[PDB]
Design a protein around this ligand. Structure first.
Ligand SMILES: Nc1nc2c(ncn2[C@@H]2O[C@H](COP(=O)(O)OP(=O)(O)OP(=O)(O)O)[C@@H](O)[C@H]2O)c(=O)[nH]1
Ligand SMILES: Nc1ncnc2c1ncn2[C@@H]1O[C@H](CSCC[C@H](N)C(=O)O)[C@@H](O)[C@H]1O
Length: 261
């Protein structure tokens, strides 16, 4: 009965053209053309991002929503967009990325942007069964969309349930994807986590309108229900008039090489 649940219901009722236009209406998007061409030809020394994820994490990082420091752990790293971004930051000492990378799941990509040598990728790993390890910065970008709000809720609570085990070890910084922050049980879990570990949820402007995803980050503190609903109101407004109008931005280009000595 939350605004977000209403949004999900109306989203599923849109026709093909409206859905297509809607998902990109008034959003920011990084131009991935050059990056994709470089990766497709096997270039590993141009500093291009391995996925759209690098730009998403940069957005949070550049405005203080999450500090990237010391021992970084990336749960559900996929191709490694967040791992490579973190590895290039001077404040980061090491990065451990874990991902399924099997049965259709994206496997870590091998490129040599700055600090690639301080990253340890581990595939064939279900992070829900992975024993928590002590770290300073915890990252998690897991959450598979579902046309069912109940299902998105279940998936989101499972992610937060697992992440809480890791935060309990004591972490300074975190950035965790919250697939369906609009579900009531999720809102309550977020309020509980905020009281225990601080932080709040933030909507990334690079996220498409077809998902209500927001990220639980350590760098700010705000009223969770209020801000989740602000995003619900924005998503609903954009559904009334979908123009498909997108604003293109330059993708992330990282320096290259190993971090040595
Ligand atoms: N009306 C409508 N909704 C759709 C359609 N495809 C997906 N959706 C909705 O949009 C949500 C996100 O789907 P996608 O963007 O295709 O998947 P993604 O993993 O977020 O990328 C789904 O969970 C549905 O609720 C479609 O063809 N029509
Ligand atoms: N239970 C699980 N354990 C490990 N990885 C999982 C998982 N569930 C989903 N994943 C992986 O989590 C990834 C989410 S997409 C992550 C993109 C990454 N942030 C980037 O910047 O490139 C997907 O590859 C998905 O396969």
């Amino acid at each position: 009965k939350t605004l977000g649940e209403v949004w999900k219901r109306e989203l599923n009722l849109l026709d093909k053209r409206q859905f297509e236009l809607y998902k990109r209406t008034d959003i920011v998007e990084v131009d991935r053309d050059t990056a994709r061409r470089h990766l497709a030809e096997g270039k590993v020394d141009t500093g291009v991002a391995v996925s759209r994820g690098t730009a998403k994490l940069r957005w949070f990082h550049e405005r203080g929503y999450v500090k990237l420091e010391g021992r970084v752990i990336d749960l559900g790293c996929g191709r490694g967009g967040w791992c490579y971004y973190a590895a290039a930051q001077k404040e980061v000492s090491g990065v451990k990325g874990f991902t399924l990378g099997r049965d259709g799941h994206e496997k870590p990509m091998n490129v040599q942007s700055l600090g690639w040598n301080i990253i340890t990728f581990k595939d064939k790993t279900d992070i829900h069964r992975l024993e928590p390890v002590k770290c300073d910065t915890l990252l998690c970008d897991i959450g598979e969309s579902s046309s069912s709000s109940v299902t998105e809720g279940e998936r989101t609570v499972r992610v937060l349930d697992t992440v809480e085990k890791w935060l309990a070890c004591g972490v300074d910084n975190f950035c965790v994807k919250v697939l369906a922050p609009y579900m009531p049980d999720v809102l309550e879990k977020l309020e509980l986590l905020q009281r225990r570990f601080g932080g709040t949820v933030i909507r990334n402007p690079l996220s498409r309108n077809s998902t209500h995803e927001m990220y639980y980050v350590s760098g700010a503190r705000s009223n969770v229900t209020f801000t989740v609903n602000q995003t619900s109101r924005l998503l609903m407004r954009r559904m009334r008039r979908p123009t498909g109008k997108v604003t293109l931005e330059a993708d992330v280009i990282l320096p290259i090489g190993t971090r040595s000595v």
